[PDB]
Subunit: 122 residues, 4 copies
């Protein structure tokens, strides 16, 4: 799925995810969020199962963005965990955790959970 | 927190997280899980906020492991999202998503969620 | 939103949620899962914000199902947390946690996370 | 575990959870949060597995609070999903989702995830 995964993806919020899948299971790229305390591209890194099951199962993968670039610092990081599904209308179906740096007092409210679906179009 | 983060960490389950923090916000290292369909070390990559707030907030960070190495493939990836807290008893407080590759029929049960606390000792 | 919420709802998996919203903030009804270790109807109870914001914000709500009825026991419970959004095509947008009873050794893998979107049709 | 569950619990934040477990699987009671936009008691309802596995597994359960009482409205609801574990140091180990009512624009940031551990003392 190296070929399947590598390229430009769009989620339901209009964010842009550009990724290269390595033969070693590496994910490298940039992420641009259509929403939140973000502007322009942020470095992402992650991993994927480079030898997935042959039974029509999806391909497990995940990656991280730290919301600091030359323009802004949101003192936060998002991790997406999900699976790539191939075929005519390929998808990456994810769930994500966004953790902010907080004081110990505010730690209980440090983390958001959500879900993003990425497609090759739109 | 490059110095603070870089090194060996242990979670409440007995797992071992060895990581180097780069000046650029990179996280790289290996993970050994004390539990689940895992043996020996797996590659990890992620990101951290290399310029956190100076108000005593923690440092946002995340990373991914894909559960394939030369020994095993568990067709799954975990992402940890959390914050590094410095001082005498330094911690990385995380929550994590573990997604398995699944069929479309089993996709609803693809993802576990949990929480890991990492310390420099035990 | 007492009127808006009360009735029959369907999620993307084909599951059926039948609920009565009380003036006091109560939710009561039954749930029928199209998937997993489930048959027929299970009791549900929950809560909703009976006096939501007047700014077009959605209505916060949650409920629980324990997966025991007269037919089966899946030694598990799901909680849905989300918001009701009114207007022409009303929705309940949720995220859910499914916890199984486990041994202390398997407790790390006790909890699934997912997302369900409920509509009045389909 | 009707007997085991019924009574007063306290979490790591110093919150108070007062619950009665019904023979039918019902949970009813009140919750007082030491943190966030909250004061005094809020109604809670939920469910638990009234006939759990006899293999030493914990008991699955869940409950909801909507953060409206006669004093305040935080336009939000929390659901706790977890398991009760019996014996000398009885625990309820939970994960939780807090959803706020939001605009469609802010819906991506609607939901916090955390974890609470409840004990009979402290
Ligand atoms: C921050 N709300
Ligand atoms: C159980 N997988």
């Amino acid at each position: 799925d190296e070929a399947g995964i590598t390229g430009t993806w769009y989620n339901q919020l209009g964010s842009t995810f550009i990724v290269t899948a390595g033969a070693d299971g590496a994910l490298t790229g940039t992420y641009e969020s259509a929403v939140g305390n973000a502007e322009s591209r942020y470095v992402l890194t992650g991993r994927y199962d480079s030898a997935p099951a042959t039974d029509g199962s999806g391909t497990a993968l995940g990656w991280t963005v730290a919301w600091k670039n030359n323009y802004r610092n949101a003192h936060s990081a998002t991790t997406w965990s999900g699976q790539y599904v191939g075929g005519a209308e390929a998808r990456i179906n994810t769930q994500w955790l966004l953790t902010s740096g907080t004081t110990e007092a505010n730690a209980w409210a440090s983390t958001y959970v959500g879900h993003d679906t990425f497609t090759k179009v739109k």
